[PDB]
Design a protein around this motif. Structure first.
Motif, short mmCIF file in Angstrom:
data_model
loop_
_atom_site.label_atom_id
_atom_site.label_comp_id
_atom_site.label_asym_id
_atom_site.label_seq_id
_atom_site.Cartn_x
_atom_site.Cartn_y
_atom_site.Cartn_z
N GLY A 122 -13.11 69.53 9.92
CA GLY A 122 -13.60 68.19 10.16
C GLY A 122 -15.11 68.15 10.20
N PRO B 26 -7.85 66.12 12.09
CA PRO B 26 -7.76 65.27 13.28
C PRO B 26 -6.79 64.11 13.14
CG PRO B 26 -10.02 65.86 12.90
CD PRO B 26 -9.25 66.40 11.73
N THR C 199 -19.14 65.05 15.30
CA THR C 199 -19.81 63.78 15.56
C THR C 199 -20.59 63.77 16.87
OG1 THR C 199 -17.68 62.98 16.40
CG2 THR C 199 -18.32 62.33 14.17
N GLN D 203 -14.32 64.92 14.09
CA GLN D 203 -13.76 63.81 13.34
C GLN D 203 -13.36 64.30 11.95
OE1 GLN D 203 -15.58 60.27 11.16
NE2 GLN D 203 -16.08 59.81 13.30
N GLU D 204 -12.45 63.57 11.32
CA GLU D 204 -12.08 63.90 9.95
C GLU D 204 -13.26 63.69 9.01
OE1 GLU D 204 -8.81 61.43 8.85
OE2 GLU D 204 -9.96 59.56 8.89
N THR E 42 -16.82 66.82 19.62
CA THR E 42 -15.86 65.89 19.05
C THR E 42 -15.81 66.12 17.55
OG1 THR E 42 -16.14 64.23 20.78
CG2 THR E 42 -15.29 63.49 18.67
N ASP F 149 -11.13 66.36 20.68
CA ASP F 149 -12.09 67.02 21.54
C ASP F 149 -11.83 68.52 21.56
OD1 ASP F 149 -13.43 64.68 22.25
OD2 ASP F 149 -12.08 64.29 23.93
N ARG G 298 -10.04 59.32 12.89
CA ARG G 298 -9.44 59.94 14.06
C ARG G 298 -10.25 61.16 14.47
NH1 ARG G 298 -6.45 55.39 14.66
NH2 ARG G 298 -4.68 55.31 13.21
N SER G 299 -10.32 61.39 15.78
CA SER G 299 -11.17 62.43 16.33
C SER G 299 -10.43 63.18 17.42
CB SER G 299 -12.48 61.84 16.89
OG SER G 299 -12.23 61.04 18.03
#
Ligand SMILES: [Zn+2]
Lengths: 88, 130, 48, 40
Positions: free
Chosen positions: B36, B20, B39, B111-112, B109, B127, B124-125
């Motif tokens: 990732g 991400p 979340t 996220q890293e 979502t 979608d 960072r994320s």
């Protein structure tokens, strides 16, 4: 007589005699017309009961789509269909 | 002995095996494999594809198909067809739930991973639509 | 994905007193003229 | 080739269709495409 037509007879019922010089061809006026939006696909019907006007469209297609103002759909799927979006 | 068949991909993605954080705009319109941590997971919501309606005056079933930019990979002309409550003849339509089709839609979502993230920076994320 | 709500009416009360210039009363008077006019002994407009 | 703008679109989609002004076709098939008729 045709010579004594004045402004007092405007929008009044008058009885008047004469001779007929020419009869035109039969034009087609619209009584009931179904319209559909170009992309919105909204189906509407216009009923006309007054065809006796000349030189002017006293009844015309709507300037904008009627799906927004009616709010017929609960989901109501800014999107505008454009100017004069209805075809007959 | 009707639903169209989908595809899924495994294997080495090379430079397309990203993060991400590592996803930039050079990878747009490309097939990426992003690892990732999930979340946020939105509620699984049905999305109407074809609605089926009944006209009781004429006793006939109609349908309308609906598309969006998400269900297709190739962009087409967006034609918003409104929900039909009235047929072409002017008769009222009744929505036939149970004959309409709804496809499950989800937003997640990604996220890293905190194991591979920088230890002090904000994460960072991205979608993902399912 | 609900339907269009419908609007309907039903006459209950007398309402305000009718007026001669009202469109409904003009329509009713014209209807009675069509149904009830006699030239000599026949309803000429009804038969027409 | 200019990306220095913030809070505003210094380059946007054309407000009207460019087919009429270009006159690219000799056939040239009143028809209006509408305001903001372009899709990316
Ligand atoms: Zn429309």
């Amino acid at each position: 007589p045709l010579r004594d037509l004045d402004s007092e007879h405007v929008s009044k019922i008058v009885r008047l005699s004469g001779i007929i010089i020419s009869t035109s061809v039969l034009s087609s006026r619209a009584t009931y017309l179904s319209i559909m939006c170009r992309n919105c696909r909204h189906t509407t019907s216009i009923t006309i009961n007054n065809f006796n006007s000349i030189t002017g469209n006293t009844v015309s297609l709507p300037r904008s789509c009627l799906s927004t103002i009616e709010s017929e759909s609960s989901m109501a799927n800014k999107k505008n269909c454009g100017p004069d979006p209805y075809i007959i | 002995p009707r639903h169209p068949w989908k595809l899924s991909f495994k294997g080495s993605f090379g430079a397309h095996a990203l993060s991400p954080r590592t996803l930039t705009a050079q990878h747009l319109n490309k097939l990426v494999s992003v690892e990732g941590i999930v979340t946020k997971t939105s509620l699984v919501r049905p999305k109407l594809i074809r609605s089926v309606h009944y006209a009781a005056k004429t006793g006939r079933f109609h349908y309308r198909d609906y598309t969006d930019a998400t269900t297709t990979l190739t962009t087409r002309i967006p034609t918003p067809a409104i929900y039909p409550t009235e047929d072409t003849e002017g008769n009222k339509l009744t929505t036939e739930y149970g004959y309409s089709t709804f496809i499950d839609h989800q937003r997640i979502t990604v996220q890293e991973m905190p194991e591979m993230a920088p230890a002090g920076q904000l994460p960072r994320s991205i979608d993902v639509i399912l | 994905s609900f339907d269009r709500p419908e609007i309907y009416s039903a006459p209950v009360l007398q309402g305000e007193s009718p007026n001669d210039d009202d469109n409904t009363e003009i329509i009713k008077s014209f209807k009675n003229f069509i149904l009830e006019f006699r030239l000599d002994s026949q309803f000429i407009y009804r038969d027409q």
